[PDB]
């Protein structure tokens, strides 16, 4: 998605988290904007030494490397839950014998 997400000079609209207190569980979503305390002195919302903002903006330029250029990724999660099947394929059904 370099063509759409890249503009002259680079796009910074998309962020990613750099630090977190612990390992994320599968399908776990944190969106808090708290200051990250990498040190011993609590930040209490105060940045500085060992108090960084966990997010960092991507640099997506048209001249960036292919490994640095933006990519759009979709993750489809499949489940067979306690219910009749709801999402089915284009298969054509037949009469019963």
């Amino acid at each position, epitope marked *: 998605s370099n063509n759409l997400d890249s503009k002259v000079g*680079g796009n910074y609209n998309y962020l990613y988290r750099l630090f977190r207190k612990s390992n994320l569980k599968p399908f776990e979503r944190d969106i808090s904007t708290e200051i990250y305390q990498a040190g011993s002195t609590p930040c209490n919302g105060v940045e500085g030494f060992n108090c960084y903002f966990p997010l*960092q*903006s991507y640099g997506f330029q048209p001249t960036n490397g292919v490994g640095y250029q933006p990519y759009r990724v979709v993750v489809l999660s499949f489940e067979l839950l306690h219910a009749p099947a709801t999402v089915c394929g284009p298969k054509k059904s037949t009469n019963l014998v």
Partner: nanobody
Framework: QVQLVESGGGLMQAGGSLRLSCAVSGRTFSTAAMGWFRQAPGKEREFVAAIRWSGGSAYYADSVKGRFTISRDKAKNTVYLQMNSLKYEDTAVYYC????????????????????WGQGTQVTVSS
């Protein structure tokens, strides 16, 4: 929805120390950038200091380089301007502003418009 509440400054001697604040409420400036301006009588509003919010890189005008310093806090949602080594010419009405556009060059934030402006606070430097 978005309010930029300024504080600090005032009248003091030359070379004094001040640190202007501009509290940001209802919005974050992560991908865009924030900037400071001042407006002296009979003059146009002039650029002083602009900073990228996420990255922390600073950009200063030649009238303020080495004398004024810009800093920000993200959780408190406040930007500061450390006003050291004052001069007589620095007397003006200072305007905090935040942009809605993500500009690739932090230098483009010195001229490109800001869609949020503060109320304005006077700063006077005396003999």
């Amino acid at each position: 929805q978005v309010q930029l509440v300024e504080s600090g400054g005032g009248l003091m001697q030359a070379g004094g120390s001040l640190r202007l604040s501009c509290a940001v409420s209802g919005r974050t400036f992560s991908t865009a950038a924030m900037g400071w301006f001042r407006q002296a009588p009979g003059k146009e509003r002039e650029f002083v200091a602009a900073i990228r919010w996420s990255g922390g890189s600073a950009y200063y005008a030649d009238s303020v380089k080495g004398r004024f310093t810009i800093s920000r806090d993200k959780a408190k949602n406040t930007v500061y301007l450390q006003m050291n080594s004052l001069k007589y010419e620095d007397t003006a009405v200072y305007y905090c502003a935040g942009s809605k556009i993500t500009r690739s060059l932090l230098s483009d934030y010195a001229t490109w418009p800001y869609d949020y402006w503060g109320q304005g606070t006077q700063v006077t430097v005396s003999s």
